[PDB]
């Protein structure tokens, strides 16, 4: 089990799990789209 | 020592703007105002799976040279 690249494996905004071997652009990536349709900006 | 990273929004659009560590993510915005056209009030930074805020400074997120960080807008009254 050598996955991660990232500070998270879930989408902490949509609780969705993000896609394996996935890189930190990835997680950001959604996070950054997620985080715009949010209406908290928690710190996670 | 002054160091360059580059921000990418929703719509794709590069930014290539220069920071500094002791800098803070609220000031990477206020350059990048100039450059798109929206204010750091509305504009906000993701990386390393964190949401980067004026709470915290570039040093304190580990962004180095050449970070690839995204662009959010979470409009208030719009
Ligand atoms: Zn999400």
């Known amino acids: ?44 | 020592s002054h160091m360059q990273i580059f921000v990418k929004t929703l719509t794709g659009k590069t930014i290539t703007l220069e920071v500094e560590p002791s800098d803070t993510i609220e000031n990477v915005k206020a350059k990048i105002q100039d450059k798109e056209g929206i204010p750091p009030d509305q504009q906000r930074l993701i990386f390393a799976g964190k949401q980067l805020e004026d709470g915290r400074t570039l040093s304190d997120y580990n962004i180095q040279k050449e970070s690839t960080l995204h662009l959010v807008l979470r409009l208030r009254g719009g």
């Open chain 1, 1 to 44: 089990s050598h996955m991660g690249a990232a500070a998270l494996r879930s989408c902490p905004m949509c609780q969705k799990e993000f896609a394996p071997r996935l890189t930190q652009l990835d997680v950001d990536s959604h996070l950054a789209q997620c985080l715009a349709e949010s209406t908290e900006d928690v710190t996670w």
